């Protein structure tokens, strides 16, 4: 009875493992020009937070930033546009709204461009039993949230009721939307990642590589993504391949990865570690290119503009640095 | 060389900085305390005696403001959100002290105390231990099967020897005897001096921290 079902699931696992088992990217990428040495220096230093910052998000126009306080920045000239009285940040594509959520198990939406020159809460979405790990604005009216309830949710701003629930063990720690805003990926603490379908409401694919995953980001193309685990290893997965391409690890580092992001054209993979500094790997190569040193504590967050003009990093010390 | 607009766009940033600086100094005059006891040991029964997710409670005592964070029903992995409580002044741990007869959640309390005390983030955070439930424990001394959970224990029927043995057993789990220090109170249901003990403990730890920062220690 139950043993028959166990054998059935086991042979499903065997058949899928046999079906996904070619070529190696690390060996086909041979005879290519290395980037060399990449040594971007700090261009702006941002002060004002008196805490360990935990999240940030670049603006849509690659000039505004958002970082018990929520600060809007100005990366060109260092000015505080507005301060609003947490583990997540989100900046709406239209620039009208921002989102924040943390251990309180609710996510709050703030409206920026209003009359009376004030920012006030527009929605307080609730329904999770856990802690929110990541939030992203799908549209101006739709937002997706991944929390520690082992489930993800697709919401609706105008009516706070949940629209879709994604389930299918451990806390989900990171979340990333595809460039076309039609697919969706999430990595959990059970050493697994999953690709879902927002329109359907059902899981599409799963990837297993080990320890908990706490960083994930889509490739600019939208057909691959990168994950960062706590075993001091970063990995790249392909949607159309259902496999793992390479491990971004070195023998001298035994420190986990806190944040991961790409650059435009998908050549430089910037990983913010917990060893007081970030690293700049060559996404197509197995060798490190550059190091972004200058932080005096654990690097938590990291972001790259849409035009790829600047890279903003924050750490457990209250200073947020904009490099170029 | 600034424009007419930008010169007026810098005064706004200066006012924002002033507001943040003035508001940032009101959060440095409050003491952070973390409730981390067992779920059914009496955490809900101790918050009311002093006065979804994390619940913050505010106390005032001798012109000192206390913030106490109760992580009641998070029901998640403790290793993924325990980073947020680094720098908390003290951790108030509560033990039922009458939960040894489940056979056992007494060993669960022992394991939880071992996990929290030897944490890497809490290597210098003092722990205040409250051995609760004196009423039932003292009333059950007539037929207490305390030797069941303690095979190596031999002692008199008086509550004093058993209480001393169990307290020494909880103190024995500490591995950092140079920085950390476990405080005990033996709280009762009908006490009134519970806040006094925590006030004295936080004063002691703050004085020791000041001495360590100054250079004498």
């Amino acid at each position: 009875e139950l043993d028959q079902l166990r054998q059935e699931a086991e042979q499903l696992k065997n058949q899928i493992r046999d079906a996904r088992k070619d070529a190696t990217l690390s060996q086909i990428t041979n005879n290519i020009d290395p980037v060399g040495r990449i040594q971007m220096r700090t261009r702006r230093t941002l002060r004002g937070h008196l805490a360990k910052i935990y999240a940030m998000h670049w603006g849509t126009d690659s000039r505004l930033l958002v970082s018990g306080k929520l600060i809007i920045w100005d990366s060109y000239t260092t000015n505080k546009v507005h301060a609003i009285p947490v583990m997540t940040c989100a900046y709406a594509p239209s620039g009208n709204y921002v989102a924040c959520g943390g251990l309180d198990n609710i996510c709050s939406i703030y409206n920026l461009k209003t009359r009376e020159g004030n920012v006030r809460v527009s929605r307080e979405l609730a329904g999770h039993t856990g802690y929110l790990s990541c939030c992203r604005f799908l549209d101006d009216n739709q937002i997706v949230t991944s929390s520690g309830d082992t489930t993800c949710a697709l919401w609706d701003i105008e009516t706070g009721q949940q629209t879709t629930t994604f389930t299918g063990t451990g806390d989900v720690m990171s979340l990333s939307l595809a460039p076309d805003t039609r697919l969706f990926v999430s990595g959990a603490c059970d050493a697994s990642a999953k690709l879902w379908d927002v329109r359907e409401g059902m899981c599409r694919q799963t990837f297993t590589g080990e320890s908990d995953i706490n960083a994930i980001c889509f490739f600019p193309n939208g057909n691959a993504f990168a994950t960062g685990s706590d075993d001091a290893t970063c990995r790249l997965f392909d949607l159309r391949a259902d496999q793992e391409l390479m491990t971004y690890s070195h023998d001298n580092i035994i420190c986990g990865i806190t944040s991961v992001s790409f650059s435009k054209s998908g050549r430089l993979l910037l990983a913010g570690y917990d060893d007081f500094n970030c690293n700049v790997w060559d996404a197509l190569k197995a060798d490190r290119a550059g190091v972004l040193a200058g932080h005096d504590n654990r690097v938590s967050c990291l972001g790259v503009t849409d035009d790829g003009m600047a890279v903003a990093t924050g750490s457990w010390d209250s200073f947020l640095k904009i490099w170029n | 060389t600034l424009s007419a607009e930008d010169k007026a766009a810098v005064e706004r940033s200066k006012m924002i900085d002033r507001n943040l600086r003035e508001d940032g100094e009101k959060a440095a005059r409050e003491v952070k305390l973390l409730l981390l006891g067992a779920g059914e040991s009496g955490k809900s029964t101790i918050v009311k005696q002093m006065k979804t997710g994390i619940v913050e409670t505010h106390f005032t005592f001798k012109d000192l403001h206390f913030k106490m964070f109760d992580v009641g029903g998070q029901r998640s992995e403790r290793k993924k959100w325990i980073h947020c409580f680094e720098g908390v002044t003290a951790i108030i741990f509560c033990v039922a002290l009458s939960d040894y007869d489940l056979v056992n959640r007494m060993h669960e309390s022992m394991k939880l105390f071992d996990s929290i005390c030897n944490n890497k983030w809490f290597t210098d955070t003092s722990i205040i231990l409250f051995l609760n439930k004196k009423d039932l424990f003292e009333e059950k001394i007539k037929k207490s099967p305390l030797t069941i959970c303690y095979p190596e224990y031999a002692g008199s029927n008086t509550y004093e020897e058993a209480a001393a043995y169990i307290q020494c057993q909880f103190e024995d789990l500490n591995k950092r005897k140079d920085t950390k220090e476990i405080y005990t109170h033996f709280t009762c249901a009908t006490d009134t001096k519970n806040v006094q003990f925590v006030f004295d403990a936080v004063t002691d730890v703050i004085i020791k921290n000041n001495l360590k920062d100054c250079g004498l220690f």
Partner: single-chain antibody
Amino acid sequence: VQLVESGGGLVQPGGSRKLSCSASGFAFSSFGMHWVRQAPEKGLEWVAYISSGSGTIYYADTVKGRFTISRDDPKNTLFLQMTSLRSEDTAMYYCVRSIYYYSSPFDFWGQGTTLTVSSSDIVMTQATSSVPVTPGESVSISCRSSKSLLHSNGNTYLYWFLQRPGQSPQLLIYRNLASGVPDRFSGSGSGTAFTLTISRLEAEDVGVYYCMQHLEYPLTFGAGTKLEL
């Protein structure tokens, strides 16, 4: 949302009086507040500008050291003390507000109050003045700036306030189009040449337009013909 201006000017020469204004539904503590005047046959020119926190009290170049501004954030009240009133004070005063992010200054205008007395400036001239609006057609306004209004910030200053026959003006372009119901309004800029364009006329489209000729501390862009007649 609402700005109520009070204080009626009818005094003998050599007197003084106050002009008050009260704001509702604002973060008045975080809005800069200007004061503007309009003569019966003239444009809209500054008389004072006040910044948030009372750190910038710029006054008028025509009259300096006689008028003063006082502000009350708890009372949400902004008012003007006038001294040594002369014969040439017979204008309509408005109490426009503005705020500068890193966004649409002069967005809201008050009702204004009358003042009558009993008995480095950019200037532009054109042959065509007070062009009547032809029904069933499209009207366009062309203007030229004496200097280059474009600044190294890249933000050329282009204001096109519209004043209908009535009580208070409106904003059309704040630098383009503001948060207004109409859409047909367009503004084209190229160096020193600027053009306001109307896609189609309407019953409420008729009015008087005012130019932009301001870069420095005195924003005297009021040079403009009155198209009322």
